Structure formats: structure tokens, C-alpha cells
Amino acid sequence: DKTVRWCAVSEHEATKCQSFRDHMKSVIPSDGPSVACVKKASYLDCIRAIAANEADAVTLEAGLVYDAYLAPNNLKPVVAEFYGSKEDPQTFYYAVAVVKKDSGFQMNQLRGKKSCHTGLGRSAGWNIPIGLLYCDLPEPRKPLEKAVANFFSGSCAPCADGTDFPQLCQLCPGCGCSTLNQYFGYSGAFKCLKDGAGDVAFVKHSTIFENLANKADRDQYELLCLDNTRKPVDEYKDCHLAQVPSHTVVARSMGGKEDLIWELLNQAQEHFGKDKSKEFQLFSSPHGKDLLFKDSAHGFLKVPPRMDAKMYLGYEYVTAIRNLREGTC
Ligand SMILES: [Fe+3]
């Protein structure tokens, strides 16, 4: 069943990918799916490599799936992550704004505060919050990156160009686009908040639970709700910025190996899915969080035949992104 060339971003993911390869070989027969690992410094290099037929698959944050669809890449989503539980699979999650208790400010008082984002172009960390704050940003609002930099009084926006928009990396110099940057991703943005670098972290509903095991510690944090009030972190269903689509594995439109990608991942979730193995775990890792797949994922679901990015994401989310680039107040 041939080999799937997986694209790992940076060393932590590369290590998890090698383990994935090794463990799959020990359980899957020389007749089944195998995994090869291609290491890149950023997801952008992964999209390039896959379009150039040098790699086959990579799991992309949903907000990045739309971009990957554009030419000359035209990658398509083939396998989606799902969350919650196997009994009731959720193909969406909640974007929330975590803050520290007693910090004294609401959503409409974010101007001048310091922000921690999962990464530029990502759903919860960027598209949803910046989409909501768009008109609050000072003019000229284009380029958006600078308008955001001027709005806050220091930020960490992984993957943003620190040369053109220096304040966007004030909280994480260089704005590294990988786990090499300790403040990259959901847990990285949260650490940026915990460490006291930022005042707010735009992450998902499970993020704080993934980083603080004791409720007493979580009680020192809160969420910013859209009605300009705050609520406990366990009340995200009644205090979130929006619901967004699951992250998805993408592949080429031509000779993309989506059939083998699904076969690989479907067998992988049975052998190494949640609570399945004591040797290897697809959804966790001793090397870090959200490596290759999100830790909050509980399994995979195959994307319908030939579905493209726009259709996968849905009209509501697609409109948001488009309205982020355009915008009018
Ligand atoms: Fe996300």
C-alpha cells in the first residue's frame, strides 16, 4: 500500500514522526501502509513540498487550509480530525480568549493590551479574534498585520514577518513558525499568557485544561465573552468568540495519495488512537503538544470525495476569512 511522505514541522514533530514510522512498521505488515518523514521549518514549506511532489501530507490548521487551496498549490483536505469523543465526534471546536482573573478589562477594552496568538492565519489565534476586532483597529487598517501591531501594545504572532511588523514579535522575538518558538500554537500562546508576557491568549476551549490539571490553578483564569463580561474557563460554551472547523490533513489534487493517506490514518487510529497503545500515541507525545495532530483530537474522519477547501470549511467560515482581507467600517 505504498508509502506516505508525511511533512513534519521542526524537530519535535520530526521526532514524533520517526516514532510514528517505527511503531507503524512493528504493527502493520510489509503489505500495509508505511510512513516516511520530511522535515521542514514551517507549514509553508510543507505546502510547497506537497505541491512539488516531494511530500504527500500534512495536517493544516483550518484557517490555513483556505490559503493552501489557492494556486499554485491547490491542495485539498482529505482527512479531518474530530474532537470530543468517539461516541459523539465533533468536527468543530471553540475559539476562546483566555485572560487572568482580576486583570480588569473586557473584550471592548483590548486596545493597548498585549496579545498572544497561536499563529498568523490560524482560526482561533487569528482569523476569529482579529475578524471581530477589525473596526477597533486604527486606520489605515491595511496591511492588517501593522494595524494589529498598532492596536495592541506588544504581541506574539508566530509566522508573521518580524522585520516589517516588529511589535507582532515583541512577546516572542522572531515570531518563529514552529514549536521551536515556545509561544507557538495553542499551548504556546497560553504559556505566553501564563508567563506574564501577554494579557490575553487567543486559543481553543481545551487549551487551559491541557496545561493546568488542577481546577484551583484554572480558577485564576477567565474568558472574555462577546457581551463584554467574563466567565469561568469551564463555561466556554456560553462564552466563546466562535465555532470553527476541525484541522485537516491536506494533499495534492493530482496523484495525491488521499486513498493511502486515509488507509494509513484509519489503521493508525485503531493501533495508536486514544487509549489504544502503551508504545505509541497519535494524539499526545512525550516530546510536545499538538505535534502532527492536535492533542485534543480523538480520531479521524474521511473528507467526502473531491471536496475542496471552500466547501469543506463552509460558507460561514469562508465569508469570515474573505471579509478579513476586505473589510469596511
Ligand atoms: Fe486551530
Q: What is the DSSP string of 284-311?
A: --TT-SSSSS-TT--EEEEPPTT--HHH
Domain termination site, one of 247, 265, 289: 247
* Domain identity same for 142 and 271: no
Q: How far is the CA of 2 from the centre of ligand 1 (A)?
A: 30
Q: How far is the CA of 61 from the centre of ligand 1 (A)?
A: 5
The Cα angle at residue 150 between residues 178 and 173, in degrees rounded to 5? 30
- At 171, list the grid cell: 512577546
Task: Look at residues 8, 116, 125 and name the one whose alpha carbon lies nearest to residue 62.
Answer: 125
* Domain identity same for 125 and 208: yes
Task: Look at residues 70, 23, 17 and name the one whose alpha carbon lies nearest to residue 47.
Answer: 70
Q: How far is the CA of 60 from the centre of ligand 1 (A)?
A: 9
CA–CA distance from 221 to each of 31, 234, 268 (Å)? 50, 10, 36
Q: How far is the CA of 127 from the centre of ligand 1 (A)?
A: 10
Q: How far is the CA of 121 from the centre of ligand 1 (A)?
A: 10
Domain termination site, one of 199, 216, 247: 247
Cited resolution, angstroms: 1.9
In the chain, the amino acid numbered 103 is S
**Cα–Cα dist 105/110, whole Å:** 7
* Domain identity same for 236 and 255: no
* Domain identity same for 88 and 234: yes
Residue 33's CATH number: 3.40.190.10
Task: Look at residues 192, 225, 218, 220 and name the one whose alpha carbon lies nearest to residue 94.
Answer: 225
* Domain identity same for 274 and 321: yes
* Domain identity same for 182 and 148: yes
Helix (H) or strand (E) holding 81: strand 76-84
* Domain identity same for 64 and 87: no
Residues in Cβ contact with 24 at an 8 Å cutoff, skipping those fewer than 6 apart: 33, 34, 35, 264, 267, 268, 271
Q: How far is the CA of 31 from the centre of ligand 1 (A)?
A: 34
Q: How far is the CA of 62 from the centre of ligand 1 (A)?
A: 6
DSSP assignment, residue 253?
S
Q: How far is the CA of 27 from the centre of ligand 1 (A)?
A: 31
- At 41, list the grid cell: 521549518
Helix (H) or strand (E) holding 65: helix 62-69
Using DSSP bridges, classify how beta strands 200-204 and 115-117 pair: parallel, antiparallel or unpaired.
parallel
* Domain identity same for 75 and 165: no
Q: How far is the CA of 137 from the centre of ligand 1 (A)?
A: 23
Residues in Cβ contact with 149 at an 8 Å cutoff, skipping those fewer than 6 apart: 155, 165, 166, 167, 168
Helix (H) or strand (E) holding 19: helix 10-27
* Domain identity same for 63 and 91: no
Q: How far is the CA of 297 from the centre of ligand 1 (A)?
A: 11
- At 168, list the grid cell: 507582532
* Domain identity same for 72 and 3: yes
**Cα–Cα dist 161/179, whole Å:** 17
Domain termination site, one of 247, 270, 293: 247
* Domain identity same for 87 and 234: yes
Q: Is 261 helix (H, G, I), strand (E, B) or coil?
A: helix
Q: How far is the CA of 32 from the centre of ligand 1 (A)?
A: 31
Q: How far is the CA of 149 from the centre of ligand 1 (A)?
A: 21
Residues in Cβ contact with 309 at an 8 Å cutoff, skipping those fewer than 6 apart: 65, 66, 68, 69, 75, 76, 77
CA–CA distance from 172 to each of 58, 166, 197 (Å)? 25, 10, 9
Query: How many domains is the chain partitioned into structurally?
Result: 2
* Domain identity same for 30 and 129: no
Experimental method of this PDB entry: X-ray
Q: Cβ of 139: how many Cβ atoms within 10 Å?
A: 9
Structural domain harbouring 207 = 83-247
Q: How far is the CA of 143 from the centre of ligand 1 (A)?
A: 23
Task: Look at residues 143, 131, 108, 91 and name the one whose alpha carbon lies nearest to residue 304.
Answer: 91
Residues in the chain: 329
The Cα angle at residue 162 between residues 158 and 167, in degrees rounded to 5? 90
